[PDB]
């Protein structure tokens with residue numbers, strides 16, 4: 798499955814604990830509040846987080862405070878409220894990591910109650 802595919806969430810809805818680690822891009826699944834439900838191996842390779850340790854933490858408050866901004870978290874919240882989260886943008890991640898330019902794709906999951914954040918280096 799390629800980053801930014803039109804129906805990426807269809808493919809990832811099918812994936813368990815293992816298949817998500819084989820993606821070529823970082824993949825985080827969040828609930829509506831930003832709590833981390835899933836976090837794959839490719840994302841940990843970019844950020845220096847242990848995927849097994851971040852589960853349950855809040856992405857915007859605790860893990861990724863540089864994303865607590867209108868440009869990221871504001872766009873996330875707008876999408877969980879509208880029910881149609883689907884946006885791609887560039888961003889820099891720099892909290893307890895080497896400042897790293899990325900491309901982000903946020904997309905509602907098929908559950909309707911969980912939201913994907915996809916990341917790749919640029």
Ligand SMILES: *C(=O)/C=C/c1ccc(O)cc1
Pocket residue numbers: 825840844846860861862863864889890891892
């Ligand atoms: C800014 O503080 C970004 C930090 C960050 C982004 C994504 C992650 O999975 C971990 C940390």
